Amino acid sequence: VNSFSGYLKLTDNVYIKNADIVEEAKKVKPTVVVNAANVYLKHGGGVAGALNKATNNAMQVESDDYIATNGPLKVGGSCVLSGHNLAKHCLHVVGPNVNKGEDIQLLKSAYENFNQHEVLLAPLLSAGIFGADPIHSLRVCVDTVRTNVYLAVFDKNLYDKLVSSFL
Ligand SMILES: NC(=O)[C@@]1(O)CCN(c2ncnc3[nH]ccc23)C1
Ligand SMILES: [Cl-]
Numbered sequence: 476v477n478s479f480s481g482y483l484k485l486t487d488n489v490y491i492k493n494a495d496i497v498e499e500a501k502k503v504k505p506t507v508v509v510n511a512a513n514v515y516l517k518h519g520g521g522v523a524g525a526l527n528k529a530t531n532n533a534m535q536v537e538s539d540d541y542i543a544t545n546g547p548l549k550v551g552g553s554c555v556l557s558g559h560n561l562a563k564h565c566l567h568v569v570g571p572n573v574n575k576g577e578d579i580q581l582l583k584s585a586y587e588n589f590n591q592h593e594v595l596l597a598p599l600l601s602a603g604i605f606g607a608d609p610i611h612s613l614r615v616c617v618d619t620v621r622t623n624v625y626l627a628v629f630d631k632n633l634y635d636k637l638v639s640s641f642l
Contacts, residue, residue, distance in 0.1 A: 477594060478503050479625045485641060488623045489616065493634035496522060496598055496627040497529045500561035505625075508558055509589070509597035510534075511605065512567035514547040516554075521604040530559040538567070550577055551584030566592060573606030582612065586619040594623045603629075613637055 482490035492499070500508045511522040516538035518527035527534040537556055548554060553568040570585040571577035585600050599616065601607035609628075616624065628634040 477623075479505075479596075482625055483638060486617055488621060489626065490624070491613075491626045491628060491634070491637065493629075493631045494627040495525075495629050496596065497525050497561070499596060499625075499627050500526070500558075501529070503596065504562060505558075505594065505596045506563045507566050507592045507595045508562035508564075509595055509600075510565050510567045511598050511600060511603070512548070512553075512569050513572065514550060514552075514569050516542055516548070516567060522598045526561065526565070529561060533557075533559050534565065551581040553585075553588035562596070566595065568600060570600035570605055570612075571607070572604075573601065574604070579607060579611075582607065582615050583619050586616055589620045589624055590622050592622055594625070596625050596627060598627060598629075602633075609633055609637060610640055613641070 482492045484490055510526055518524055518535050548569050550569050550571055556565050558565045568585050568588050571579055571581045582601050589595055599609050599612040602609040602612050
């Protein structure tokens with residue numbers, strides 16, 4: 476039993492809710508919140524910009540030190556950093572950004588990072604400003620993640636379409 480509330484159950488391990496991931500994180504304080512990161516951990520917009528804003532830019536400061544030490548992530552890769560005031564940990568996961576021409580096949584690799592964590596709050600990878608079809612992102616999620624994932628979908632109209640079209 477965990478403290479996630481109001482989710483629709485899609486499968487054995489995947490749950491979905493129309494919610495602002497920032498407000499969800501501030502309520503639940505999960506062990507892991509997933510950020511929709513880019514390889515430079517530049518949290519300018521989308522989910523990343525919103526999560527960083529909620530940390531008062533502390534996520535960006537920590538991220539800049541990480542990059543200065545380690546260099547950029549790989550597309551499809553991840554790193555674990557602090558969750559600041561939102562969660563214990565933030566798993567920064569880089570899905571492909573279609574608006575950069577990145578290979579959508581790397582989306583499965585991106586979701587594989589979730590399997591290293593027993594429970595996660597997460598957005599749909601490569602959705603929103605990353606330019607992939609969110610229906611496809613959901614299918615890959617369900618077919619790749621085996622740990623317990625609670626998906627927050629900010630857009631209510633998008634949330635309704637994802638549920639109704641789910642196979
Ligand atoms: N005032 C705010 O910060 C927002 O209400 C608008 C920006 N922000 C988000 N921007 C993009 N993608 C997102 N996914 C989940 C939340 C979210 C929250
Ligand atoms: Cl985003």
